[PDB]
Ligand binder design. Structure first.
Ligand SMILES: O=C(Nc1ccccc1)Nc1cccnc1
Length: 171
């Protein structure tokens, strides 16, 4: 049976209990923590691609007021459909299953200035989503997995001083 497990779930949850934040910039910014998954129950002989996107969690934006994240207004129109292709793609099931699959190079941005970046709206909450695509499949079968532990608010600057400190500390 196909099983996709979050790596470092305890680390993610240290950030989630503060409400996690990720910086977006013009030129794009890497995530900490990095999203990493362990995979079992692929066909080791088959070839797959791994894709990453970010799903908008709410019909509203957030604001950090008096040390509390609270609903902050109506949402911006949805960021365009951005998908990140894992740079190991396409590859054997055996390749994906032998070691955690790491999205260490994905950059989050708030300007559509290209470079395979993920466009997010500042002060909106997003949940990472991984897709497994089988190569050469006439049915174009896809699997999609969400990672609730990894939810975060996109920000141009850290709001929560505990997040700023955690980010310097564990990284
Ligand atoms: O700090 C880490 N995990 C953790 C933190 C607190 C409690 C239990 C586990 N992992 C980690 C990952 C990547 C680089 N450095 C450290």
């Amino acid at each position: 049976e196909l099983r996709v497990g979050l790596e470092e779930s305890e680390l993610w949850l240290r950030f989630k209990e503060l409400t996690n934040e990720m910086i977006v910039t013009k030129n794009g910014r890497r995530m900490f923590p990095v999203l990493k998954v362990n995979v079992s129950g692929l066909d080791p002989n088959a070839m797959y691609s791994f894709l990453l996107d970010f799903v908008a969690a709410d019909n509203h934006r957030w604001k950090y007021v008096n040390g509390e994240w609270v609903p902050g207004g109506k949402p911006e129109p949805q960021a365009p459909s951005c998908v990140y292709i894992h740079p190991d793609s396409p590859n054997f099931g055996a390749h994906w299953m032998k070691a955690p699959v790491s999205f260490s190079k994905v950059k989050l941005t708030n300007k559509l200035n290209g470079g395979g970046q993920i466009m997010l709206n500042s002060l909106h909450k997003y949940e990472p989503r991984i897709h497994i695509v089988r190569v050469g499949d006439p049915q174009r079968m896809i699997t999609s997995h969400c990672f609730p532990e990894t939810q975060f608010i996109a920000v141009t600057a850290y709001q929560n001083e505990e997040i700023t400190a955690l980010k310097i500390k564990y990284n």
